[PDB]
Write a protein that binds this ligand. Sequence first.
Ligand code: 07D
Ligand code: 07D
Ligand code: 07D
Ligand SMILES: CC[C@H]1c2cc3[nH]c4c(c3C)C(=O)[C@H](C(=O)OC)c4c3nc(cc4[nH]c(cc(n2)[C@@H]1C)c(C(C)=O)c4C)[C@@H](C)[C@@H]3CCC(=O)OC/C=C(\C)CCC[C@H](C)CCC[C@H](C)CCCC(C)C
Ligand SMILES: CC[C@H]1c2cc3[nH]c4c(c3C)C(=O)[C@H](C(=O)OC)c4c3nc(cc4[nH]c(cc(n2)[C@@H]1C)c(C(C)=O)c4C)[C@@H](C)[C@@H]3CCC(=O)OC/C=C(\C)CCC[C@H](C)CCC[C@H](C)CCCC(C)C
Ligand SMILES: COC1=C(OC)C(=O)C(C/C=C(\C)CC/C=C(\C)CC/C=C(\C)CC/C=C(\C)CC/C=C(\C)CC/C=C(\C)CC/C=C(\C)CC/C=C(\C)CC/C=C(\C)CCC=C(C)C)=C(C)C1=O
Ligand SMILES: COC1=C(OC)C(=O)C(C/C=C(\C)CC/C=C(\C)CC/C=C(\C)CC/C=C(\C)CC/C=C(\C)CC/C=C(\C)CC/C=C(\C)CC/C=C(\C)CC/C=C(\C)CCC=C(C)C)=C(C)C1=O
Ligand SMILES: COC(C)(C)C/C=C/C(C)=C/C=C/C(C)=C/C=C/C(C)=C/C=C/C=C(C)/C=C/C=C(C)/C=C/C=C(C)/C=C/CC(C)(C)OC
Ligand SMILES: COC(C)(C)C/C=C/C(C)=C/C=C/C(C)=C/C=C/C(C)=C/C=C/C=C(C)/C=C/C=C(C)/C=C/C=C(C)/C=C/CC(C)(C)OC
Ligand SMILES: COC(C)(C)C/C=C/C(C)=C/C=C/C(C)=C/C=C/C(C)=C/C=C/C=C(C)/C=C/C=C(C)/C=C/C=C(C)/C=C/CC(C)(C)OC
Ligand SMILES: COC(C)(C)C/C=C/C(C)=C/C=C/C(C)=C/C=C/C(C)=C/C=C\C=C(C)\C=C\C=C(C)\C=C\C=C(C)\C=C\CC(C)(C)OC
Ligand SMILES: [Fe+3]
Lengths: 274, 255, 259, 44, 44, 44, 44, 44, 44, 45, 45, 45, 45, 45, 45, 45
Amino acid sequence: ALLSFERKYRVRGGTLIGGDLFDFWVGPFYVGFFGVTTLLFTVLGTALIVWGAALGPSWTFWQISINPPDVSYGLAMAPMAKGGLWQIITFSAIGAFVSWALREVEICRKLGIGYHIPFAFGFAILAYVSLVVIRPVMMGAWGYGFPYGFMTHLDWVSNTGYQYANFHYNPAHMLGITLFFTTCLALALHGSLILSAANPGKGEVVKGPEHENTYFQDTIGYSVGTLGIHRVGLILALSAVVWSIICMILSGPIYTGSWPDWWLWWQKLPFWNH
Amino acid sequence: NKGDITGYMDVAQVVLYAFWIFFAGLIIYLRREDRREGYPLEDAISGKINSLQGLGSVFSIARPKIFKLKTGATYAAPNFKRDAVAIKATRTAPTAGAPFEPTGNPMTDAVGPAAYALRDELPDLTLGGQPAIVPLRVAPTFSVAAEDTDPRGLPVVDRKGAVAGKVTDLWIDRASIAIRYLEVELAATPGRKVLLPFAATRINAKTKSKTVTVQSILARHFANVPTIAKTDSITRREEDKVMAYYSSGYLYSDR
Amino acid sequence: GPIYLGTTGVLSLVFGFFAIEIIGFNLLASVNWSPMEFGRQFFWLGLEPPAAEYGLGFAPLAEGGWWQIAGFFLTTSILLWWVRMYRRARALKMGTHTAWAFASAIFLFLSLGFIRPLLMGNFSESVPFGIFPHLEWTNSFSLNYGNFFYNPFHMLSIAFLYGSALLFAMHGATILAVSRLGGDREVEQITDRGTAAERAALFWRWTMGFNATMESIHRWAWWFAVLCTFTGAIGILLTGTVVDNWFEWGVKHGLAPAP
Amino acid sequence: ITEGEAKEFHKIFTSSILVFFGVAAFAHLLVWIWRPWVPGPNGY
Amino acid sequence: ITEGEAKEFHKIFTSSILVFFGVAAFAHLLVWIWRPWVPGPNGY
Amino acid sequence: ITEGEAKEFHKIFTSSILVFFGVAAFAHLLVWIWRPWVPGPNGY
Amino acid sequence: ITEGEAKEFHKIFTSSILVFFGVAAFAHLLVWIWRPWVPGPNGY
Amino acid sequence: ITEGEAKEFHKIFTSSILVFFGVAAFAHLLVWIWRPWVPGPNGY
Amino acid sequence: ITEGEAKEFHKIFTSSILVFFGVAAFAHLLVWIWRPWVPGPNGY
Amino acid sequence: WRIWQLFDPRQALVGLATFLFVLALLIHFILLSTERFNWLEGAST
Amino acid sequence: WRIWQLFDPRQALVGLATFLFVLALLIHFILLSTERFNWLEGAST
Amino acid sequence: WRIWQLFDPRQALVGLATFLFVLALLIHFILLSTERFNWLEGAST
Amino acid sequence: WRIWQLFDPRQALVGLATFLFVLALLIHFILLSTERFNWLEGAST
Amino acid sequence: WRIWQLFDPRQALVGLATFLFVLALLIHFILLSTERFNWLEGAST
Amino acid sequence: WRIWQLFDPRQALVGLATFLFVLALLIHFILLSTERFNWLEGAST
Amino acid sequence: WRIWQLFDPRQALVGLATFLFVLALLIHFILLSTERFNWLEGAST
Ligand code: 07D
Ligand code: 07D
Ligand code: 07D
Ligand SMILES: CC[C@H]1c2cc3[nH]c4c(c3C)C(=O)[C@H](C(=O)OC)c4c3nc(cc4[nH]c(cc(n2)[C@@H]1C)c(C(C)=O)c4C)[C@@H](C)[C@@H]3CCC(=O)OC/C=C(\C)CCC[C@H](C)CCC[C@H](C)CCCC(C)C
Ligand SMILES: CC[C@H]1c2cc3[nH]c4c(c3C)C(=O)[C@H](C(=O)OC)c4c3nc(cc4[nH]c(cc(n2)[C@@H]1C)c(C(C)=O)c4C)[C@@H](C)[C@@H]3CCC(=O)OC/C=C(\C)CCC[C@H](C)CCC[C@H](C)CCCC(C)C
Ligand SMILES: COC1=C(OC)C(=O)C(C/C=C(\C)CC/C=C(\C)CC/C=C(\C)CC/C=C(\C)CC/C=C(\C)CC/C=C(\C)CC/C=C(\C)CC/C=C(\C)CC/C=C(\C)CCC=C(C)C)=C(C)C1=O
Ligand SMILES: COC1=C(OC)C(=O)C(C/C=C(\C)CC/C=C(\C)CC/C=C(\C)CC/C=C(\C)CC/C=C(\C)CC/C=C(\C)CC/C=C(\C)CC/C=C(\C)CC/C=C(\C)CCC=C(C)C)=C(C)C1=O
Ligand SMILES: COC(C)(C)C/C=C/C(C)=C/C=C/C(C)=C/C=C/C(C)=C/C=C/C=C(C)/C=C/C=C(C)/C=C/C=C(C)/C=C/CC(C)(C)OC
Ligand SMILES: COC(C)(C)C/C=C/C(C)=C/C=C/C(C)=C/C=C/C(C)=C/C=C/C=C(C)/C=C/C=C(C)/C=C/C=C(C)/C=C/CC(C)(C)OC
Ligand SMILES: COC(C)(C)C/C=C/C(C)=C/C=C/C(C)=C/C=C/C(C)=C/C=C/C=C(C)/C=C/C=C(C)/C=C/C=C(C)/C=C/CC(C)(C)OC
Ligand SMILES: COC(C)(C)C/C=C/C(C)=C/C=C/C(C)=C/C=C/C(C)=C/C=C\C=C(C)\C=C\C=C(C)\C=C\C=C(C)\C=C\CC(C)(C)OC
Ligand SMILES: [Fe+3]
């Protein structure tokens, strides 16, 4: 099935690799060679996750967990019953994410638009890789990656954040929190303004950029613009992800001590050291 | 037995399930709002209204909402105004999911990245009712910031180094202050002027001329840029046509 | 710049300024009026809420009374700011979506500061005014009430926060991608659908099977942002009042194996 | 794409796939001689 | 891209992959005298 | 841009990669005299 | 970028980098007399 | 900036640099007489 | 922006900076009389 | 033979080479995981 | 004297005043922090 | 030559360089990870 | 003398002064951190 | 010599310098990590 | 001996001085991190 | 005497008054902090 305006855009070309073989659609989904690879990796990883659930002790969705190999294994590939399944799932997921991003690139090429969307998804892929590959590799063992479970990855988050006394005192983690809260606040403001301009109340006429700028100027003192707000939102989300990656790289590969104790330098400054 | 509703049920679980019900209803409503443009779905080949849908099709498409405009006209969403089934392209395979192959010149035929939406033949209007996008000649009040470089008089060059023309005017937006289009006088056929989107043009910094580089299309494609009826105002349809023609360069420039 | 305050803005500014002055004066008095010690311990300084024995009444000034006064003034200022952003939208003949999205954040703020202490009978577990004091309040709240990770409404609030970040990273990237087709003129696209909106919808359809419109994506964003704080406020209210241990609740409801 | 280019491609393709499979078979035979990978009833 | 420049490519490309494989083989051979990397029946 | 200018680049490019490689090799020789990095049967 | 002014850069750049390297060599020599950084078989 | 302007900047700039270096050298000499910063064999 | 006015600005700037430096020097002499800030080898 | 007319030589060969390389790397890593076929840290049989 | 034609004596003076005040405040705060030179809380010499 | 008439090195040279360098780096890191072939530590046999 | 032809003399002066001041401040703070060269709270050699 | 027309003779130099410098830094840090080749600490053989 | 036609002299000189300064700062901090070469603290040979 | 042509008398006075008020408030806060000079509490000498 097609939309009322899709046939004129469903054109040949735009593939990065594979040529005409995979240039076709199955329903609404564009397939592509990287889509075929995405399906390959998704099916493999999902089947192996269900296999790990079957090997596990419970079939409860919350309690299903695929655990990484023990820290004693180091960076060596582990037996499939002792974390090798986790490693295979990790690399299949990485392949699936990369293939999804490249499929988005192919769709962007076909539609003649920018690559900002795959570029932004690259940051999510980078955060995932840093959590499952980069940080455990610089830490010396695959056991430091989070287990693939609904609750066990939360337990991993809790244990990792309490290994450093209090993760709330990580300076890059504070910046990540600030940018994550600001992204939500800005999203609420942007959606609210656009919906208030498009729906100005029953019996009223749709407003425009003048009114949109005037509203926020009158309320808070300044505005950003029509495209400045989208650029700011993208930069905010990507900066939050980047500072989260930075805090995770600092926590354990570089800094191993207590983050609350890291803040003594502020109290030891020469102009206040009494 | 603090929060227990029954032997196993409790207040937190009851509130969680209430939120689940509300969130399912909210997803239904959000999809309803999503289906205000482009729906109902048409068959890929025949173009008749036909799709694989369940018992939720009754609630799927909402009643048309009416947007009241300051010009007195109204826009309905969904408007149920479909594009023409026949387009200037032919599928490479008889399957529904097969892609289309342009019959002639895709840039002129407006298929694929060159395709544009049949918007209203009316220019965007500001709060005062005057057209929003006008050349700098018609708007003496506006001026380019002194910290920036005026694109007027700067050569227009493509990705291969071929010069397409010179910038003779700038088209501004009065509603949201910005530069929208650049008026370029083509080197070939002197006196012919074409509109050039600002968002598709980057300045080449220190070139001693700051050539306004256009990576979209080549120099030879500037002669085929769609024209505009008025010399001081541009309609929404012409605007889309120009942006769509320029956006198709990355895919059909070397073809 | 051209900030319109009005009567409601004047009220809100006066109330919030009184609250800020009270908080700052208390912080500076905590270090015996030392500018040096204030700079040294600014993060660690805080204005703590009254103890549990005072209930909801007025505690002595040196023992939480200043906190109660500052908190009430801040709450009044925030409510008057909500009224202000409602009235500005009404005056500009626009919708009150901004006011009703701010209402969710106000609901969460009241749940953290006033509503939950009202339910519990005292202000002892309210949020103190200070950077590190309120971070420590967060940590101690989670630690005392089991594990907040096991709160389902905390789960939902985190999911909607991640969804807000994900949705803005999608929407900004999409609008920048179609910015060369006039996609930044979102209301104009809503009123008269253009090739920018068409290509954005088609990209997302070809990517993940379904798409939104130029208005409904903002509806998605608005609802995600509101639901973050709404679910979080519900979780805060249910924490301790009906569930004393979220880990034990999760164990009972299958979120974790029984110890 | 032309018939002659396709014939040359098929000729080199069958030669290369035969040499690839021969190298793989020789490697597998050497690895089997070194340490076989089929366990016995009682293990290795 | 002309076919003559493809001939030049092919030429120096094969002449360089030959040197690359030669130096790789020499390095592997030297490492083989240093410490062989195929364990025997009793390991190392 | 021009083939002649590319050749003129390549001339001093090889003449400079030569001196870079010579400095690297001389430094490696000095480090080898200081402490060799190839362990013996019993280690270092 | 004119060739003559570019050559004048090259000349003065070479003189300045030579001065910088001479000063760095002097400093490294002084540090070598102070405490050498190359350990012997028995260390420092 | 004109050639004469550049030359004027240059001469008085090096004139001011010489005084700065002299003052820094005098201060460092005074600090050295106060407490030298280069430890001996056994230390300070 | 103009030479004569800038010259007289330098005149009054010197007349002010000399007074400022004299006041600072007198204050530093008084502070040195009160408590010197250069510890000896045994400290203060 | 005509299968190389239905299948582009370049597009087929690039995909085949990438697939073979990934499969070989996966098999080699799986072998490194075990104890019998770990040729680097060779263990006694 | 040449300085004042290139550097505006309205911005140079303001920058100098702010920088000097900041430096003086910093040095005074350092002296207050130190024990020997804290004149407000006089300790042993 | 006919092979490179279609596999022109517009970016294949960069692809091959990136592949070879990464493979060499991975093999070297694996050797460093192993004890027998760690030339920097030089454990006895 | 051509360094001022390439670089604005005003900007060069401003950047050089700022860099020198920051470097001096950093070195002074490092000396204060060190026990031997802390001239304010001086310790015996 | 035609590879200098194939690749930008500016980006090529920049990328090569950035690659060689990063490789050198990595190798030097690895040597610092090793006990035998740590010239700063200088352990005995 | 004509690199400066390829690279802008100003950007080259504002990118090669920063690199050298950062490298010098890093090496000085590394020396401070070692007992032997720390001239501020001071230890035995 | 020429300062009121160079600097704006309306902005200069406001800035000076704000600076003086901030300095006076800071010094009074420091005095309140000190034990000897806390006139409100009045510690014995
Ligand atoms: C002691 C407990 C403790 C503690 C007191 C405390 C406090 C707080 N913290 Mg923290 N934290 C603690 C623990 C701790 N903290 C985190 C992290 C963070 C982040 C990162 C968010 C992000 O960017 O996610 C980025 C997200 C990723 C990883 C994106 C990856 C996703 C991809 C590729 C896509 C996957 C797609 C599929 C599988 C397909 C789906 C298919 C279909 C639907 C069909 C961040 C901003 C953040 C939030 C808060 C706040 C607001 C608070 C409050 C309220 O106090 N914390 C670190 C991290 O992940 O960094 C990357 C991390 O690991 C770690 C630890 C150990
Ligand atoms: C041990 C620590 C711990 C822990 C291990 C863990 C885990 C994680 N959590 Mg959690 N959390 C912990 C504890 C804990 N958790 C929070 C909450 C959240 C949020 C906040 C949402 C928000 O937007 O807040 C932000 C909104 C607020 C607080 C309300 C908006 C405020 C308004 C309008 C007032 C306007 C202000 C002024 C006018 C200025 C006044 C001036 C002056 C006072 C001077 C959220 C989504 C979230 C995120 C994470 C993640 C991602 C993680 C990871 C990765 O570890 N957590 C709870 C809540 O209900 O949130 C709504 C809550 O209260 C609470 C507690 C105590
Ligand atoms: C505790 C005492 C101490 C201390 C251990 C120390 C070390 C050294 N300072 Mg000094 N200095 C100390 C105190 C202090 N200092 C100055 C400053 C400055 C400036 C002036 C700017 C300039 O352009 O100088 C002009 C720069 C020149 C002269 C560059 C020439 C460099 C040469 C020929 C090579 C240097 C290396 C050696 C000679 C190695 C021999 C070592 C051994 C035998 C063991 C600057 C770069 C500079 C150089 C150095 C040097 C060469 C040394 C060596 C190697 O002894 N010092 C700061 C300043 O004014 O910054 C703008 C500042 O405020 C401040 C303070 C507090
Ligand atoms: C970087 C900024 C934000 C961002 C952006 C972003 N995400 C994106 C995009 C963008 C721009 C897309 O275009 C793309 C998309 O199409 O979304 C609809 C996407 C996307 N990001 C998603 C989710 C997501 N994004 C997140 C976050 C973020 N992404 C950032 C906050 C998060 C979290 C945790 O905060 C999640 C959960 C998806 C909706 C989509 C990814 C689609 C995809 O990868 O498809 C290919 C893969 C599959 C269909 C399934 C693969 C299954 C694997 C084989 C197994 C994986 C297992 C896993 C490792 C663990 C699972 C258990 C967990 C409980 C631990
Ligand atoms: C949907 C949930 C998200 C959200 C949304 C949200 N927040 C919002 C809004 C929305 C939709 C607004 O519309 C509103 C706003 O205006 O945003 C710009 C706001 C807002 N939320 C804010 C912040 C905020 N949002 C946060 C987060 C979030 N809110 C969530 C992520 C957070 C955190 C903790 O993450 C914070 C801290 C504010 C910036 C703003 C509300 C402003 C407000 O209430 O101000 C009250 C007024 C004062 C304190 C007065 C101060 C006066 C000064 C002292 C100046 C001097 C005045 C004068 C001199 C006084 C007179 C003196 C005489 C009497 C002597
Ligand atoms: C279609 O497009 C649309 C527009 O366009 C037409 C728009 O416009 C907008 C509107 C969006 C914006 C205008 C910006 C959106 C971007 C962000 C949210 C990220 C950037 C975050 C900020 C700068 C915070 C801005 C929030 C304000 C101004 C709220 C105003 C509240 C009051 C006036 C009440 C009293 C103020 C208080 C109590 C604090 C308010 C917060 C700040 C002013 C910032 C925090 C500052 C401090 C507490 C200390 C720092 C002090 C400063 C900054 C002064 C000293 C200088 C320094 C640098 C330190 C949208 C959404 C939009 O869809
Ligand atoms: C300008 O405003 C904008 C809008 O627009 C106007 C918008 O819209 C949006 C977009 C935003 C919305 C629509 C709002 C909602 C978005 C969110 C809330 C974000 C969260 C998103 C989700 C929760 C949805 C996630 C769903 C995903 C990731 C899709 C999953 C898809 C797959 C798993 C398959 C992908 C398809 C492939 C690879 C091919 C097709 C596959 C099939 C049809 C099934 C299998 C098919 C076969 C068996 C036959 C073919 C098989 C082959 C080829 C062999 C394969 C071999 C195997 C067996 C493996 C934005 C941002 C925007 O700002
Ligand atoms: C146009 O042409 C001109 C004129 C220019 C001439 C040019 C000619 C050219 C370029 C000729 C080139 C020919 C070449 C290079 C041919 C190469 C052929 C090769 C190498 C073919 C290889 C084929 C291999 C295949 C198909 C292997 C398939 C194996 C599979 C699918 C095995 C799967 C195994 C599984 C799933 C099991 C795994 C077990 C483990 C343990 C890994 O599971 C966990
Ligand atoms: C255009 O010109 C006209 C015509 C108008 C003429 C007018 C001319 C005028 C008015 C000119 C003005 C001239 C003036 C006032 C010039 C002043 C010049 C000065 C003071 C120059 C000083 C230069 C200093 C330099 C270059 C010093 C550099 C030092 C460096 C890089 C030191 C680095 C040290 C390191 C990295 C040490 C680190 C050690 C530790 C341990 C700290 O590292 C961790
Ligand atoms: C239309 O009207 C016309 C123009 C016709 C006439 C109008 C005439 C008018 C409006 C005339 C008004 C004249 C007025 C009101 C003039 C005011 C003059 C005053 C009050 C001047 C005062 C100046 C004070 C100065 C410059 C003080 C400088 C002090 C400094 C920089 C001290 C710094 C101390 C430090 C850094 C150390 C502090 C110690 C601690 C312990 C705090 O350090 C941490
Ligand atoms: C010029 O003066 C200046 C501006 C320099 C003074 C300086 C001010 C400063 C530095 C202010 C800010 C200081 C800091 C560090 C503030 C940080 C605040 C933070 C991070 C607060 C975070 C959370 C606090 C929350 C969520 C508290 C909410 C409390 C509420 C809602 C309390 C409500 C209380 C009520 C309604 C009381 C009711 C009882 C009544 C009074 C009705 O009867 C007993
Ligand atoms: Fe629309």
